[PDB]
Symmetry: D2
Subunit: 343 residues, 4 copies
């Protein structure tokens, strides 16, 4: 017997937010880096990690030129960045919503190793999640993000890891959809190792199928859900070389065999690629001559901001130039969303 999880108005908000995020030509900037990863990135660039530098760097990211207004539909933030204010006086969620963007927040509490596996981990962060999503919904967060990690090994991914990560993602998305927050499932598959297109494509199919079975099990309103997969790409130690067209064909085959078409949009990871390779691959994916009945766009953390961070270097007066650099990649990625990119 059916007791509906959602009223039709709840489905209306989830569908409208998911359509406004993944709108044609728009993408996702992921400024959600925690203090450890951003500490590594500020230590590489050669500055001290303080709250002021992090706030100023996200100022450099967020208040860039109005040319990125038809580029970014939504920005993912850390928890701390929701309660930081810009030097103009405006809080960063209002900064995001003022230029048409949507506020999100990365909500997981890290990765926990699973017993008995070969280095396989699950994700943490389920306690207090309804109250926290209610609080973030009061502060203007309209979508969320959760990151599960899987690695390709000798006999990994085992069935235990895929089942547990799929069940956790479905539980998370149910809780987020209860509170009027569009969830984004991110089934990340680690690119480390040496494996061809074929095996990585294979485990991509198994992982995405288990995810969508668990989503059907937990009554998830799939019209208000976004998918964040990685491009099927060979391992870093894999010796074989492939054109970008084969990678695009393999991605659209791995999606067209799994993703049911009510899922509103597909946002890709960069996954340790270069700044240009991700845009080239996404432009290839948007040019693949099969029938792709959803939005195909980008959600790039490092691939948007890495070289702009390099051109910043920790000095304020370089800012505009660094900001200009960021805009460049954004504009390129916008073309990568519509297939009209050419390098």
């Amino acid at each position: 017997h059916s007791h509906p999880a959602l009223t039709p108005e709840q489905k209306k908000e989830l569908s409208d937010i998911a359509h406004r995020i993944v709108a044609p030509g728009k993408g996702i900037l992921a400024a959600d880096e925690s203090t450890g990863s951003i500490a590594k990135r500020l230590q590489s660039i050669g500055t001290e990690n303080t709250e002021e530098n992090r706030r100023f760097y996200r100022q450099l990211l967020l208040t860039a030129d109005d040319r990125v207004n038809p580029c970014i539909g939504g920005v993912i933030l850390f928890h701390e960045t929701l309660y930081q204010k810009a030097d103009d006086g405006r809080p960063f969620p209002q900064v995001i919503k003022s230029k048409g963007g949507v506020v999100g927040i990365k909500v997981d509490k890290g990765v926990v190793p699973l017993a008995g596996t070969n280095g396989e981990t699950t994700t943490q962060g389920l306690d207090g999640l309804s109250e926290r999503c209610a609080q973030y919904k009061k502060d203007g967060a309209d979508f969320a993000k959760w990151r599960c990690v899987l690695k390709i090994g000798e006999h990994t991914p085992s069935a235990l890891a895929i089942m547990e990560n799929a069940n956790v993602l479905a539980r998370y998305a149910s809780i987020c959809q209860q509170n009027g927050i569009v969830p984004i499932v991110e089934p990340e598959i680690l690119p480390d190792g040496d494996h061809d297109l074929k095996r990585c494509q294979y485990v991509t199919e198994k992982v995405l199928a288990a995810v969508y079975k668990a989503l059907s099990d937990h009554h998830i309103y799939l019209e208000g859900t976004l998918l964040k997969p990685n491009m099927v790409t060979p391992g870093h130690a894999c010796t074989q070389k492939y054109s970008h067209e084969e990678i695009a064909m393999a991605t659209v085959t791995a999606l067209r065999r799994t993703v049911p078409p009510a899922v509103t949009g597909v946002t890709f990871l960069s996954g340790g690629q270069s700044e240009e390779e991700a845009s080239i691959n996404l432009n290839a994916i948007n040019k693949c001559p099969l029938l792709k009945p959803w939005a195909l766009t980008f959600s790039y953390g490092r691939a948007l901001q890495a070289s702009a961070l390099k051109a910043w270097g920790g000095k304020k007066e370089n800012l505009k130039a660094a900001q200009e650099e960021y805009v460049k990649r954004a504009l390129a990625n916008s073309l990568a969303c519509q297939g009209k990119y050419t390098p």
Copy 2:
């Protein structure tokens, strides 16, 4: 680790046959009625059930006018009809392939009641299936058909019935794809009872999701598979009345939430409807303003041939008129495949 079930040439035959079957404007005639059901139908029309009458009736179905040549892409036969010859001397598979059609065969051995359930049955017919499909492949059968039955009850469909029927369908489709025969999965849901659009749509989602999970489990090459679902329609004792647009919206929602887009085509059942209601509903489904990234066509057993059987009546000299009647429905259903039908 991946050991591929299919060579790329095997995928090439399966994809080419599935594309030739479900080709735009073409549909499936199901003349696969067994001796009991066709015995009931000949007893209703008032003639004796012999081999000669069955052969002559399928002669009346199969050698109709050449106007049905851009109508039927494929015909489903009983096992016996593959070894019957027409009075011209040509065997019925050659009759089918001569006018552009593709030979199929219904291969299941009936329904067996499941213990402990409330009148829920599974399907039979797995033994010797590889040899039988090899034999039918030698005789010109290029696709198959398997029919599982589920009924909507108080606490039915239980999880046991859906799991067992999905596993049996996947096992069947693996065996058929091994031998170069395109399988057609038919997840029939019984329209008996009293239930709204909502509950029947709900159990349609659960059943189709479990089916596609089991197909992903058994490495089924989904580009060479056809789907045969029923239209989500209220029960026969249900008191509420619905327009055909609501039924079309519910069907395309129940498909767009489940069917991955590599599945080549969707052929509907008639499911106890009238001869005109099925064509009206299919014309509505082909006019629904959502994105349907596959072929939507008909596979009508009774809805093609019932009134033509009525105009036959068991007398040979009425034949042409009866045949003319059949052509009428076929032409209508062809328009129901392309959305340009108007009654």
Copy 3:
């Protein structure tokens, strides 16, 4: 391929602790009541809820006579009670271990309603659980407790609720076994409603089978795990009446069809029964003439302490008499563990 979750020494501690807890004639006192439930219980008895009254009441429970030393193998505490000290100066974990008992702690963070179900809830409390169990292991907690809730309804328990609760229990038990803490799974089935012995026995089989499948999936060392089920008992509004022998037969049938015999012991709930009915039923269960290859004992929260709380009334000078009352039930329950109870 097998990467063992546990070293053999880890299996040795888990087995030794589980054997010391469930030792023949010993049981579990559950003083783990949170502030809301104990607030309701102090408000019923007519005293104000303060930290001093809670500490003093658990003083009344814990420092009772030495006759309960061969009665209680282990005590379950709230988190707060681990950091309260007795008026002698000794902390309550040392109080427990001084008279032969083992310290436990209830670790879940409550129940969260599942979307789309009919009032079905999951359990919360997975974040930070490895660090918290390491901290409690430093403070002397050797076992844990987690409480999932399921209710018998019209079409409930659904498959979603049982699957999610089983996966959460297995994840919890893996985390606890990683840190050297013996987990106790508690699959509680709510006794509310009107349902016979038959349906409650049925859903007990389904729930326990799904739990043990998920435990086999997560590589749980079942020799170091305790099971906390409820006795299969009809609903509160059920009109049919049953002898205690039928309830004992149904419990031992529902366990002997599911529990694999390496699971070290089975501790029952009281589940809203009377103070005497639970002891009578447990004495019947220990007299059932089938082969029960494990320890069958009690884990009684209310059924040990309710009437002793009544004889306390919130006044200190009644203490000993109230404590004497507690000892009475404990002694009775000890006989209920060995089948030699007679009321």
Copy 4:
């Protein structure tokens, strides 16, 4: 909601037959060899395979001395042997029931390779099984046998093979229990290869857990079911050497972690061992100092009859001596059932 598969009288026959089969000190002779395997065995001994030689050899097996009357509780036959008569005039089922034995029949139709796996096969034989079991029940068969095969490889047994074989075994046992025939599940794991005690024990746990989950899913009355597992033994190419006590400890650990204690008895395979090694191992298993709450006995096809077949050689006049040889092993195996064997 519960609709009981079995009336209590049906449970009474299943329990009584299962108790009479596995009765203390009794075992199972498996004369169920099909024409191919027995053709290989008659070709090794150097005689022509005819119906007369097969009938005469099973005469040599079945009408041995009355000292085997407290040895064999039941005999498994091929289908053909049920309709062969002895030279006295009595049919072989009456021969079996006259000396206290129970007639069984091997009912599967062989093994079929699964697509996409690495040499993994499922089992066949489900069609017409209710009618065939009704027919064998009329002829005096009171139990059955079904044999699924799994091999230990690099990345095998995969989850697909274990799931499919468990579902097929449960479906088979439901059908057999519907007709009043006690099923015997045989989850055979192939001993070929090189693998330690540890990995074979591991996959034994996974396989048996999946089997019992599928049996709980299909409402199987486990008091009327027998289990036929193999002893966990290293591979034929494995270099490490183990005492028989370690093999006995590993078997009783692999059973005590999985088998719920209502399953009436456990009958072992010989599995390519010597004639003496199987009896030594079973005597060790019956001497393992853990709590084994079921009957542990033998079901030996080759290990009972191989050397007796050797002492036959295809000549009639050696018969008695050959028969005497058979009795020897039987008597030894009877002691192997009670732990009082000493070689």
